[PDB]
Amino acid sequence: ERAAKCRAYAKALHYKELEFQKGPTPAILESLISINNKLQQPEAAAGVLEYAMKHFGELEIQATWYEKLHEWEDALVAYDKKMDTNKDDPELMLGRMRCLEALGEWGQLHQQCCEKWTLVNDETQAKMARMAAAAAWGLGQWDSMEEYTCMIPRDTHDGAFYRAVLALHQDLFSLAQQCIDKARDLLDAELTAMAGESYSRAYGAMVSCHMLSELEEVIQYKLVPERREIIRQIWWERLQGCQRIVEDWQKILMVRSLVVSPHEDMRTWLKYASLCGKSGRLALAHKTLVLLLGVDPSRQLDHPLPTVHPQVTYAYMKNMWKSARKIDAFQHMQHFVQTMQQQAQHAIATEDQQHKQELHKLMARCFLKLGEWQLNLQGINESTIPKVLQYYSAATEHDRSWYKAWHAWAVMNFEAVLHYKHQNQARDEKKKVTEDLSKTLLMYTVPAVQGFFRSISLSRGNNLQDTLRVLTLWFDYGHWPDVNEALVEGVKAIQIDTWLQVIPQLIARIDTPRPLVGRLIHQLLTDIGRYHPQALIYPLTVASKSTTTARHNAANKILKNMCEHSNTLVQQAMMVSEELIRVAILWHEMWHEGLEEASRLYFGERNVKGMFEVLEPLHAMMERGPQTLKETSFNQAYGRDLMEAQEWCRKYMKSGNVKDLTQAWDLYYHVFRRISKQLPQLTSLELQYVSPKLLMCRDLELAVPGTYDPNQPIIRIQSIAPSLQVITSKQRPRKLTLMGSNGHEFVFLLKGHEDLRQDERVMQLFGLVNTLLANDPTSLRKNLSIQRYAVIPLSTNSGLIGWVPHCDTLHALIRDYREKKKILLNIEHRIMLRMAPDYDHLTLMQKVEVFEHAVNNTAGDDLAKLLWLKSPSSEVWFDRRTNYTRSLAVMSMVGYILGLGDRHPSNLMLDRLSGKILHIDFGDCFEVAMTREKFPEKIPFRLTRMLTNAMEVTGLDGNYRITCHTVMEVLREHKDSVMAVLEAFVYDPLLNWRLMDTNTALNKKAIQIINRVRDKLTGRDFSHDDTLDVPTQVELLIKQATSHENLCQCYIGWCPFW
């Protein structure tokens, strides 16, 4: 019955929206926030209110807007403004008061109640009572509570509630007992009275019911002396666990206050204060700590802080820093530590070990802040570097374990190395120079290495960054024995597990010319070979077949070492990969691309030296002789011609004719025409013709590609499905399907000619970003995540991509809808050309019209509409939309940092079961797509018109933007991890090729890209000088991603009207 109630609503919202589509009225606007609320979709509705503001300033009084926007702090100062400018206006005061009762400002709420008591208004008299009761409750004054309770009706849940508290203070537990059971029933009946279209009062009933059950434990704490630990435990646990915004916890604690004074709870109230500081209610956080100190809002401001409670002071000190006063904050810390170490070294009379310890651990935290703050106040230079390093090492001493302490120390050391290296590039821009430089860099490198190692061990599960960092030093330091010693110590020390995270990076340096570096890598890889091979074969197999000798040499060595070990795995994985590369581009397909290229060089470029380099590897390719039926069938129908076409080419080499060369091309064009015919015929491949070995494979010990992870029992290639659908495309990729040793099937895309190694590290980045999103509570609240793939490269050409189920490309879903609804697929295109045949060459100004002309005479629906018709219900329609909006936004921000270009309608897709969106093809990364010569992207991410449409009405105001900042905030917080990963494959030696395409050393280019990235993660991506906070930068991005000027410039294929 309850699941069927929201269905009625969802289906009403659908129309309620479709109505708003036809004309936004404050009428609908009202009934939209309401229905979205019953649907307990708060943030979506909060979007509706934004639209309410930015169009109708018309429930008026900016303070009433700041009040519905739950921004009490803004509404209070706006209500003062509106009260002092105007008169008394009985309602202005009520709002002015509500702002206080939410802010917990009992001091002002009680005063404002008594000081203004003409209140000839009798409703004003009624409302007055409820507030000024709780106001007096926070101010001790029980007489004042009773007076104002004697004015709250016993009919209201509120009237019955405050009686329970007055009884419990004056010790009347039979009264208090009954008052609770009546307040329960007066709220039970009230939750059916406003049966949906209510405030966060359905969420705040859970606040009152919580308090009522807690207030029954306060009863238990009066009569039975033997729950004084049971009760405090549940109180304490249902707190670190519980998540209720500041305001509610005030009230919840106030219930507990009737029994335990704050000075016995301490940890409770410090935990509470802690939260008021993170959420940013510092003025409040303070008042909690001043009470706990029992000493001044340090009004005696020049005086030292009281060390009476070392824990409380430390809170105050950081509240001070987070607050305005921060040189002051830094001071009190230096001194506080000094007072603390003396309070240890002397005052520790033996029989007090726990106090000593907690005291050393509090200090390590202080030392970390000291280093941290010092940096923020001064920056990094010759005078800070020693001090913070000392501060951090000091922190290291007093905690020994603690990820953070060891981290901070390593990162400092590592930034000292950087600070000096980057200073010396400054020096060389304009012998004893290098000898002090090498002494300098060596001095900070070794401890850096050391630090990262102890930090990694203390993470375990969460250390990608540190791990990657160790590598930067390891690879970057062309090895001076000192650094090498420290690494080899570390390698021994830290678990093997670790390195799996990093395998692609290691293999990128298999063939390091530096000798001391290679050795360790090989050794490490072979030990990673010993425990979890599988995690190693595929990647090693790729390397073992590499044009570059060094690579495939040293790759083979490791594989050899793995045979004394797991031989038939190395053997199976060896052949499975070989065969898949044969199956990827079949013999004739390679002749088809190689003949097009060779004809461009000859007939179109007069290049016969380039042409000979195109054909000769395809001739030598077959020189080995056919090995599969398909290779022989080809050989018959084409081989004789081709072998003798080369004959004529090799007569021309020696004769230097052109009639010798013209007999060859006579034969060459013959087979091209034959093949071209048979190419649209390739719509399936059967194993038994194409690769027999693979058909034969039964129950292998090799694991189904990209499925291996410890924790999880190994899933093996139990059999390969006999047929591969060939998706007809420009690269006819195959749809390979394997049978798993667990039963379930595994599908893949077997791609021919795209270097999948980039998209691999891209996945790596997404992995991390997922972890970050799982760990941010808000993002976890909303299920925010990226869809990642299994990318298993096979060679520089080929690779395997994990097949995601239930997905169609944006383009597909549309193509279908348009054909179903009888609309010409490319209509916006045809319209544009009808208007301006020369569209591509128009002025920006001119284009914008042609573009607008198209948009205005075509449906913006499709995607919105086709996603409604798809839905089996309406709640399923609704959640598929929630999932959509969010997933799309997540990638909007992530995609931005990555600089992910080329987001045309065939490069993204939609999971038709969840509603979520997914991006494919991560070639065009970093500004690349925008830096290109012809048709440069101006868009930061596709936020196109039918994507906007498909969201809620009031889309970008609602869930989209909210989810935008959230994601972006997580990203900016963890700006270092995110950058660790990115640097890792910008400066990857085998991937720098995607930046010399600015033509159609790299040291300097790679530098830019990463700076570009940091800019994005610090809000400096726009104005060089400003430092834009998230919501601004976000707003800026949406703006840019939306601008008709930007879109009408997009390459037509991108479909800027979709």
Binding site: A836, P837, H841, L842, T843, L844, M845, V848, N856
Partner: protein, 317 residues
């Protein structure tokens, strides 16, 4: 066709440049301009030949030879050519391009090259020459207006509101006023400190007119210096009193019901010599002749298949 005392020229996306006899609506001659839309048309002061600024070329058809094809083509510049303008004495021609340069062409000599170049960061939408032939006003997409002294080669720049592309600028014949119009749809008016001859030539801000909500596409002064005309993407040519800077007459083409999705932008205008009439270019494939005072549509020159983006209009003796 240049022998008629009234030259009226129309260009657009339909690969023709059409010539009209003002007083009738009959199209006189029509010329082949292929491989691009026309961005700007301007008849040379000499009335011998007309210039057609387009995509990476300025083709120049003859008004006297009443028949042929381009006499002069100018090439070798990439991206669009936005504005043309001539200097009174026969031989100089100026151009603003998307390639961020204002260029000066010697019409009395050979070379696909140009006598001078003035680089800016950001493309140049419009270029016009102060009546004193001494200074060229250059507006670009960044929202900067450059006064280029053709003697001192001194550049001096002025941004109004902009972080906004200024779309067109113009300067009244009497050299008292200069006007810039931008993509916000604002119109800026400056007074001219007539430095000239041993020059200073300063600009003193007078008004901002909130002319349009949509893009403002061109601005122009009547020969009188009486009126200021502003064409826009809001399908409108607004004519402003220079005494008041208030709206005198509004010419527009906006359907007659909210659900018609536009049809046509007001791309350009040119006043008549006696400032009595105004010509109008629009994306609805028409040029139009309006009475400046009543706002009467005194004629409609129909012919072009595709949109119209340019006019040129000549009244010389």
């Amino acid at each position: 066709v240049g022998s008629d005392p009234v030259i009226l020229a129309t260009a657009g996306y339909d690969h023709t440049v059409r010539f009209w006899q003002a007083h009738s609506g009959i199209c006189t001659r029509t010329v082949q301009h292929q491989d691009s839309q026309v961005n700007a048309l301007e008849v040379t002061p000499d009335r011998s030949m007309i210039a057609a600024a387009g995509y990476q070329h300025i083709r120049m058809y003859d008004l006297n030879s009443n028949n042929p094809n381009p006499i002069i083509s100018y090439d070798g510049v990439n991206k669009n050519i936005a504005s043309v303008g001539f200097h009174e004495d026969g031989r100089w021609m100026y151009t603003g391009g998307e390639d961020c340069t204002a260029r000066i062409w010697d019409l009395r000599s050979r070379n696909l090259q140009c006598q001078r170049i003035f680089q800016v960061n950001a493309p140049i939408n419009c270029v016009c020459l102060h009546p004193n032939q001494a200074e060229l006003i250059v507006g670009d997409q960044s929202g900067a207006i450059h006064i280029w002294d053709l003697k001192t080669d001194h550049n001096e720049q002025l941004i109004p509101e902009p972080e906004v592309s200024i779309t067109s600028a113009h300067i009244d014949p009497d050299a008292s006023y200069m006007a810039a119009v931008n993509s916000t749809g604002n119109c800026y008016v400056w007074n001219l400190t007539g430095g000239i001859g041993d020059e200073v030539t300063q600009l003193i801000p007078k008004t901002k007119i909130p002319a349009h909500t949509r893009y403002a596409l061109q601005c122009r002064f009547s020969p009188d210096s009486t009126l200021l005309a502003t064409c826009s993407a809001d399908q409108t040519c607004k004519i402003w009193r220079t005494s008041n800077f208030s709206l005198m007459t509004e010419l527009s083409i906006k359907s007659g019901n909210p659900g018609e999705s536009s049809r046509g932008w007001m791309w350009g205008c040119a006043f008549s010599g006696d400032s009595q009439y105004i010509v109008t270019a629009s994306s609805d494939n028409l040029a139009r002749l309006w009475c400046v005072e009543t706002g009467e549509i005194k004629r409609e020159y129909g012919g072009h298949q595709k949109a119209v983006v340019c006019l040129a209009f000549n009244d010389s003796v």
